[PDB]
């Protein structure tokens, strides 16, 4: 699946995650059904 998508968009391999796509991912971690298995960000909420 990963190969299928990023073949269509080869530029995804050479570039940065968009600065507006970073809050989106961190936002998704907060609304996720089962809590995220990792730590996405070091911040005030790091204990949580």
């Amino acid at each position: 699946a990963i190969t299928a998508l990023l073949q269509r968009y080869p530029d995804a391999e050479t570039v940065v995650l968009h600065p507006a796509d970073v809050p989106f991912f961190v936002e998704l971690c907060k609304t996720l059904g089962k809590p995220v298995n990792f730590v996405p960000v070091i911040d005030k909420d790091v204990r949580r």
Binding site: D11, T14, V15, V16, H18, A20, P23, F24, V26, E27
Partner: protein, 145 residues
């Protein structure tokens, strides 16, 4: 029959959500044949342009070059201009994203062209003089005899 054919419409289902954005700027090389000697030219005696930028009626060097060469902005073209013109703002308040600065509304990257560019073109480039000095040369310029 033909008016009816024109009068009889129908809706073919179209489900589409489109967005606008791009990778960081790249460079396309040109094909040039060169027969040259290496050590001959003194690099200390040569002047080379490392970089450059501009502030003008069309915005920075990136947006101005797009308008000059193309005539229309790309995804990054409208995104940058809307940012420079101060149409879009960035809040760390919840919903965490790009927001319209005027009306205080959250915006994605797609609608930037639709919601802004029409107004951007008018209020960028060459237009009637907008008065930031409370004086209009063409209309009314203060005189004292």
């Amino acid at each position: 029959e033909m008016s009816g054919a024109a009068d009889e419409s129908d809706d073919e289902a179209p489900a589409g959500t489109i967005r606008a954005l791009p990778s960081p700027p790249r460079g396309y090389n040109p094909a040039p044949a060169p027969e040259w000697d290496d050590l001959d030219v003194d690099p200390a005696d040569l002047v080379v342009i490392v970089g450059g930028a501009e502030l003008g009626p069309y915005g920075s060097s990136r947006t101005r070059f797009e308008m000059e060469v193309s005539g229309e902005l790309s995804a990054a073209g409208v995104l940058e201009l809307a940012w420079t013109t101060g149409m879009v703002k960035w809040e760390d308040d919840p919903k965490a994203g790009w927001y319209d600065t005027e009306t205080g509304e959250l915006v994605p990257e797609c609608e930037i062209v639709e919601r802004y560019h029409d107004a951007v073109v008018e209020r960028c480039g060459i237009r009637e003089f907008v008065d930031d000095g409370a004086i209009d040369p063409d209309h009314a310029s203060p005189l004292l005899v």
